[PDB]
Each structure stands twice: as C-alpha cells, then as structure tokens.
Amino acid sequence: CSTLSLVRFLELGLSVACVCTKFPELSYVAEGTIQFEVQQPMIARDGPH
C-alpha cells in the first residue's frame, strides 16, 4: 500500500511572505479596504527657487 505524506503550510518557508489570519465572517463581508497615512519631508531652498 501507499501512505500519503501530509504537508503543513506554516512549516514551509513561504509563510514569511503573508500575515495569515482567521476571519470566520468573510462570507458576510462586502468590499473592504485599508487606509495609508504618509507625509513627506522637505528641505528649505534659497535664492531664486
């Protein structure tokens, strides 16, 4: 006979690419989003500029 070799995802190395998480109500969820905040630096020039 043959024996099936199981594999568990978190034991691979690929898991370092994504932050998995349970979410047992994903079927009830319409469009969902995420927001980013960011502000840039600036330098104070002189002369004609």
Add this chain to the structure above:
Amino acid sequence: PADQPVHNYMIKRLDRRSLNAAFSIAVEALGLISGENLDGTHISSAMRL
C-alpha cells in the same frame, strides 16, 4: 263540515363552507430556524433571532 287539526313535519339540511389562509415562509430563514444553516458566530445568532 268541520275539519280536523293538521300536523306536519319537515327537515332542513346543512351545507358546507370553509376558510383558509396561506402562511408562506422563506428560504434563507428556514435555513436559520432549524439550526442546519446556523453558523457559530455572534452575528448568525442575531439573524436567527
């Protein structure tokens, strides 16, 4: 000549009538009433209520 005093009998029969009223209940809800489609959440319980 005189006349004797008259008697008589008679019968009256019944008749048939009936009432009715439909009561339709839905699909998604019959899933939740019987507990079959029920999921373990804090949101499915409220919809079942």
